[PDB]
């Protein structure tokens with residue numbers, strides 16, 4: 001198989017995939033998009049790994065086929081952090097997603113949506129799908145892997161599980177494993193979607209009713225863990241939305257901001273994928289079956305750049321400090337100044353650009 | 365005549381009809397009250413204890429008839445305790461709009477059926493007016509001090525600011541001058557989680573056999589997270605599984621099982637309707653409303669106060685207490701409590717919170 005036309009969308013059939021749990025999901029497709037020109041040696045691939053609700057559209061404007069622009073708009077191109085004049089930015093839709101790759105909303109063999117029959121996946125299963133997707137194109141080793149959040153967890157299992165198939169990695173706003181705080185809010189986000197009457201045990205697809213209310217609830221609660229406490233108060237405080245009265249049907253500024261944030265997600269994301277991908281986040285743990293977190297990291301030789309956000313409330317700075325101390329390929333923690341919490345790795349263009357540019361230098 | 369209830373008993377004080385800040389009127393308001401210790405000769409030793417969102421008048425004592433769970437500050441009032449009952453009379457009420465004794469959404473109105481969707485939104489200032497009206501109904505017009513945390517701290521704040529001449533001192537724990545954006549964000553969403561429950565029935569579920577249990581449990585699980593510290597949880601539960609359950613095969617995580625138990629535990633002692641009404645009184649908390657702003661209102665309050673905050677508080681960060689301490693002239697300086705239990709530290713650190721209460725009562729003595 002060949003890479004899709006630069007910019008366009010493409011599907012890569014990797015066949016059956018045996019998961020860490022033993023389950024076997026067959027006829028697996030992996031959507032992918034590429035910016036940049038593949039090298040004659042196929043050795044300049046920079047794999048960009050997206051987060052929970054992201055997809056393969058990492059950069060570019062909106063329009064046909066893409067409701068919203070890329071989540072890292074401007075990270076790939078001439079002179080950009082990932083210089084496409086000499087690098088090949090390859091992004092894929094994670095396994096279990098809903099933007100082209102096999103997931104709960106995809107159809108199985110019986111001609112009906114996977115739904116509740118979709119097997120539970122892990123971060124290592126998402127990585128095996130990406131690695132297999134690249135193999136289907138003749139790419140065994142990639143120059144670097146970069147991602148934040150789930151994308152960071154995907155980049156951590158890539159450098160630890162396949163150290164010889166990658167030359168460098170950028171771990172952004174992620175930890176070596178899921179924390180109690182992350183699982184607590186994420187398992188409750190799931191319970192919010194599952195308590196919606198229209199969830200229908202996960203087989204709501206093609207029935208007309210979906211768990212919209214539950215999905216908005218989960219997204220609103222999650223968005224709070226993405227932002228910084230001070231940034232929210234400084235920006236919204238307790239002000240009212242316009243001239244509304246929260247005492248008699250109005251809304252607060254922050255309340256109107258969260259409802260919009262959940263509305264943006266309903267029009268593009270599927271609840272089933274939100275559950276499956278969140279359950280994969282909960283299972284994140286680089287030390288499982290490797291002798292613990294410390295052993296797995298001490299035994300990883302891949303050179304990596306670790307970045308952490310100060311005001312991050314979902315992935316506190318202490319987690320990245322642990323990663324940098326234990327990974328021998330990492331000099332030290334690379335703090336990203338930002339007041340926007342976890343969203344810092346999405347908004348701090350210049351700060352994140354420096355970490356990417358440092359990561360590609362190690363790949364050289 | 366309306367009298368205080370016996371120590372350990374519950375009393376139902378009638379205050380008649382009250383007019384809320386919004387203009388609405390609440391008829392036949394009933395406020396539940398509990399006492400600890402005798403009144404002094406001049407009746408000048410009343411220490412009002414104001415509970416938090418899901419609290420009640422059972423501030424101390426074991427479980428027994430009418431009190432399934434011990435007091436939220438077990439050991440805070442009594443002989444030699446922080447509120448030494450040999451000197452002070454600990455008076456605690458159930459907040460207006462509560463489900464735990466006083467008039468609220470679950471209480472029956474005049475037409476015979478519950479208030480429900482007919483209960484008007486109340487502000488923190490409305491809850492203070494009711495408590496002051498309750499004490500007045502008995503005959504108390506001046507208290508020695510007010511103490512509370514969270515919503516209890518908000519009630520205490522509006523008390524010293526609104527009735528400076530009828531209170532000698534106050535203790536403000538883990539609270540801010542006004543509701544923050546992060547607080548209003550999660551709290552409005554919690555309200556939305558209860559109303560999205562198909563059994564909410566616009567709030568008129570009380571006499572239908574159905575209740576929004578799913579929504580309330582969800583709102584509580586999210587709220588409990590904001591009450592704890594990040595490091596506390598990871599050290600306690602990490603990513604461990606619950607018992608022998610396996611998340612890979614539909615099992616639960618340790619922290620997941622813990623949060624579920626918190627929802628159920630509140631689910632069997634609290635009313636969803638009250639949760640919504642009280643949660644929205646928190647949203648409207650703004651000591652500066654109608655007073656020229658936060659700084660003006662606090663600058664004008666001369667009551668001596670003790671302000672304390674928790675280091676790991678994630679819902680009411682330390683910066684909020686620091687602001688209160690800086691704007692209130694009656695405060696000598698922020699008192700920092702070192703705890704790992706986040707916002708819940710004001711309930712757990714009974715030794716560090718005990719001293720702040722003793723400092724507050726010391727100011728009440730000096731001012732008397």
Ligand SMILES: CC(C)(COP(=O)(O)OP(=O)(O)OC[C@H]1O[C@@H](n2cnc3c(N)ncnc32)[C@H](O)[C@@H]1OP(=O)(O)O)[C@@H](O)C(=O)NCCC(=O)NCCS
Pocket residue numbers: 051052053054148149150223226241253254256257258260264340342343346347
């Ligand atoms: C884009 C993002 C990542 C960071 O960008 P940002 O600079 O912080 O932008 P903001 O969200 O603060 O504000 C922009 C939007 O909020 C809207 N908004 C702001 N205040 C509002 C209000 N009071 N009422 C309604 N909408 C409001 C703006 O209109 C704008 O809407 P738009 O999407 O149509 O352009 C973040 O905003 C987002 O959308 N999601 C973050 C969560 C996420 O992606 N998580 C997965 C990665 S781990």
Ligand SMILES: CC(C)(COP(=O)(O)OP(=O)(O)OC[C@H]1O[C@@H](n2cnc3c(N)ncnc32)[C@H](O)[C@@H]1OP(=O)(O)O)[C@@H](O)C(=O)NCCC(=O)NCCS
Pocket residue numbers: 416417418419514591606618619621622623625629705707708711712
């Ligand atoms: C009272 C309170 C502060 C207790 O805090 P704590 O003393 O530090 O102890 P915890 O509640 O965190 O843990 C003990 C309880 O959790 C349970 N628990 C612990 N681990 C568990 C697990 N893995 N799975 C299930 N349940 C678990 C224990 O069995 C115990 O149950 P119990 O409530 O019947 O006693 C608080 O947790 C509570 O129950 N209510 C507080 C109400 C409130 O609004 N607080 C904030 C002020 S508004």
